[PDB]
Coordinates of C-alpha atoms and ligand atoms in Angstrom, one line a residue:
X1 CA 0.0 0.0 0.0
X2 CA 2.4 2.8 -1.3
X3 CA 4.2 3.8 1.9
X4 CA 5.5 1.1 4.3
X5 CA 3.4 2.6 7.0
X6 CA 0.3 2.6 4.8
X7 CA 1.1 -1.0 3.8
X8 CA 1.3 -2.0 7.5
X9 CA -2.2 -0.4 8.1
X10 CA -3.7 -2.2 5.0
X11 CA -2.1 -5.6 5.9
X12 CA -2.4 -5.6 9.8
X13 CA -4.9 -3.0 11.2
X14 CA -8.6 -3.7 11.8
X15 CA -10.0 -1.4 14.5
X16 CA -12.5 -0.5 11.7
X17 CA -15.2 -2.3 13.8
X18 CA -14.2 -5.7 15.1
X19 CA -13.1 -6.2 18.7
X20 CA -12.7 -9.9 17.4
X21 CA -14.1 -11.8 14.2
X22 CA -16.4 -14.5 12.5
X23 CA -15.5 -17.9 10.9
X24 CA -15.3 -16.4 7.4
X25 CA -13.4 -13.2 8.7
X26 CA -10.0 -14.2 7.3
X27 CA -11.6 -15.4 4.0
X28 CA -13.1 -11.9 3.5
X29 CA -10.3 -9.8 5.0
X30 CA -7.4 -11.6 3.3
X31 CA -9.2 -10.8 0.0
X32 CA -10.5 -7.3 0.7
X33 CA -7.0 -6.1 1.9
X34 CA -5.5 -7.4 -1.4
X35 CA -3.4 -10.2 0.3
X36 CA -4.7 -12.8 -2.2
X37 CA -4.1 -10.8 -5.5
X38 CA -0.7 -12.3 -6.7
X39 CA -0.8 -15.5 -4.5
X40 CA -2.5 -16.8 -1.3
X41 CA -0.5 -15.0 1.4
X42 CA 0.0 -18.1 3.7
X43 CA -0.2 -16.4 7.2
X44 CA -1.2 -12.8 8.3
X45 CA -2.3 -11.1 11.6
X46 CA -4.9 -8.4 12.0
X47 CA -4.8 -6.2 15.2
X48 CA -8.2 -5.0 16.8
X49 CA -6.8 -2.0 18.6
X50 CA -6.7 1.8 17.8
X51 CA -4.0 3.0 15.4
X52 CA -2.7 5.2 18.2
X53 CA -2.4 2.1 20.6
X54 CA -0.5 0.1 17.8
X55 CA 1.7 3.2 16.8
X56 CA 2.5 3.5 20.6
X57 CA 4.2 0.0 20.6
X58 CA 7.2 1.7 18.7
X59 CA 8.1 3.3 22.2
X60 CA 7.5 0.1 24.3
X61 CA 9.7 -3.0 24.9
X62 CA 12.7 -3.2 22.5
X63 CA 13.3 -6.9 21.5
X64 CA 15.3 -8.5 18.7
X65 CA 13.6 -8.9 15.3
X66 CA 13.3 -12.4 13.7
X67 CA 15.7 -11.0 10.9
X68 CA 18.3 -9.9 13.5
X69 CA 17.6 -6.1 13.3
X70 CA 17.2 -4.2 16.6
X71 CA 14.1 -2.1 15.6
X72 CA 11.4 -4.4 17.0
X73 CA 9.1 -3.6 19.9
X74 CA 6.8 -5.8 22.1
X75 CA 3.5 -4.3 23.4
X76 CA 3.5 -4.1 27.3
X77 CA -0.3 -5.0 27.2
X78 CA -2.0 -7.9 25.4
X79 CA -3.9 -6.9 22.3
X80 CA -6.9 -8.4 20.5
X81 CA -5.6 -10.0 17.3
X82 CA -6.8 -12.4 14.5
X83 CA -4.3 -14.9 13.0
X84 CA -5.2 -16.1 9.4
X85 CA -3.6 -19.4 8.2
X86 CA -4.0 -20.8 4.6
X87 CA -5.9 -24.2 4.8
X88 CA -4.4 -27.4 3.2
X89 CA -7.2 -27.4 0.5
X90 CA -6.8 -23.6 -0.3
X91 CA -5.9 -23.1 -4.0
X92 CA -5.3 -19.7 -5.7
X93 CA -7.3 -17.8 -6.7
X94 CA -9.8 -19.4 -4.2
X95 CA -7.6 -18.6 -1.1
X96 CA -9.1 -20.3 2.1
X97 CA -8.0 -19.5 5.7
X98 CA -8.6 -20.6 9.3
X99 CA -9.7 -17.6 11.5
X100 CA -8.0 -17.8 15.0
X101 CA -8.9 -15.0 17.5
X102 CA -6.5 -14.4 20.5
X103 CA -5.2 -11.9 23.1
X104 CA -1.4 -11.7 22.8
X105 CA 1.5 -9.2 23.0
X106 CA 2.4 -8.0 19.5
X107 CA 5.9 -7.5 18.1
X108 CA 6.3 -4.9 15.3
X109 CA 9.3 -3.4 13.5
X110 CA 9.3 0.4 13.3
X111 CA 11.1 2.8 11.0
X112 CA 11.1 6.5 9.8
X113 CA 10.3 10.0 11.1
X114 CA 7.7 9.7 12.4
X115 CA 8.8 6.3 13.9
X116 CA 5.8 4.0 13.1
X117 CA 5.1 0.3 12.5
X118 CA 6.2 -1.0 9.0
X119 CA 6.3 -4.8 9.7
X120 CA 4.4 -7.3 11.9
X121 CA 7.1 -9.6 13.4
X122 CA 5.3 -12.0 15.9
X123 CA 2.7 -12.4 18.6
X124 CA 3.7 -13.9 22.0
Ligands
V2G1 N1 13.1 -5.5 11.3 C1 12.5 -5.1 10.2 N2 12.3 -3.7 9.9 C2 11.6 -3.3 8.7 N3 11.2 -4.4 7.9 C3 11.4 -5.7 8.2 C4 12.0 -6.0 9.4 N4 12.0 -7.3 9.5 C5 11.4 -7.8 8.4 N5 11.0 -6.8 7.6 C6 10.3 -6.8 6.4 O1 9.4 -7.9 6.3 C7 8.9 -7.8 5.0 C8 8.0 -8.9 4.6 O2 6.9 -8.9 5.5 P1 6.0 -7.4 5.7 O3 7.0 -6.4 6.0 O4 5.2 -7.3 4.4 N6 4.9 -7.8 7.0 C9 4.2 -6.8 7.8 C10 4.3 -5.3 7.2 O5 5.4 -4.8 7.1 O6 3.2 -4.7 6.8 C11 10.2 -7.7 4.2 O7 10.1 -6.7 3.1 C12 11.2 -7.2 5.2 O8 12.0 -6.1 4.7

């Protein structure tokens, strides 16, 4: 989605309503957020918190990134999230996902001025 920050909002933010989600949530959202255009993106996480709350994680607990960079941050509080995982029977362009709701700490990578999330690293 143009800027890395905009791409993070498109791929990972859903405070647009849902405090949680339904059984077809990932099927709809993986498609509507354009994560099934080129291929079936195999896994993706949506965060059901305010943009302000998720942007705030960039000033919280500094942790190592999976790629070995040092610009990752873990939320002090648990956040409402939805994990989407491509099913065994899923075949492009009919991408199929399991919708898993959870409350976990998020880990995001941050970059830029202003310093904002550009990558979803993990939930713990
Ligand atoms: N530590 C990191 N800082 C900035 N980007 C990072 C990073 N660790 C991994 N990435 C990026 O992870 C990307 C692939 O996943 P993604 O960034 O699309 N995933 C969430 C997002 O950023 O919206 C690659 O382009 C990497 O450059």
